[PDB]
Design a protein around this ligand. Structure first.
Ligand code: HEC
Ligand code: HEC
Ligand code: HEC
Length: 68
């Protein structure tokens, strides 16, 4: 799987299916069985993606995940 890119009115968000994985190892987003995790404007803001970002030397503010 390759760079998907979610295009949204608040800024596109770069779903790096490859580029994150190349460092992460799939596992990081996927407990053994990878599958289509539902992402939305709660999920992506509470814990999915966020909580890794919270506990990583990476961006966390809106305009550090959304393009602007
Ligand atoms: C966390 C940021 C991810 C990384 C890195 C990988 N995947 Fe992923 N995957 C992620 C999400 C949020 C989703 C949902 C995509 C959507 O818009 O629905 C997925 C989905 C998959 C799927 C399911 C595809 C389907 O059958 O509908 C697969 C098979 C999958 N991801 C595989 C996969 C592998 C092998 C990864 C390492 C190369 C990998 N993902 C990384 C989130 C993330
Ligand atoms: C990545 C680490 C994110 C951070 C930080 C923020 N957002 Fe986000 N947002 C993210 C994703 C993966 C998505 C998926 C698309 C969807 O519609 O849910 C979103 C989406 C939004 C949207 C919806 C835009 C639309 O066209 O309706 C909004 C309004 C939004 N995000 C706002 C938002 C704000 C204000 C943030 C800082 C508090 C913010 N997001 C951070 C991923 C990420
Ligand atoms: C850890 C398990 C992560 C998950 C889950 C997600 N991301 Fe991530 N992201 C992570 C790291 C360690 C980094 C690199 C930080 C650095 O500065 O080296 C990132 C980076 C991003 C970026 C920045 C690149 C860009 O396109 O500008 C974005 C936008 C980003 N991450 C988005 C993102 C989204 C939307 C996620 C799920 C839908 C997501 N990340 C998950 C670590 C992890």
């Amino acid at each position: 799987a390759d760079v998907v890119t979610y295009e949204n009115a608040a800024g596109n968000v770069t779903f790096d299916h490859k580029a994150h994985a190349e460092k992460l190892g799939c596992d990081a987003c996927h407990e053994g069985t990878p599958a289509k995790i539902a992402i939305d404007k709660k999920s992506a803001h509470k814990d999915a993606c966020k909580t890794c970002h919270k506990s990583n030397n990476g961006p966390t503010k809106c305009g550090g995940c959304h393009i602007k």
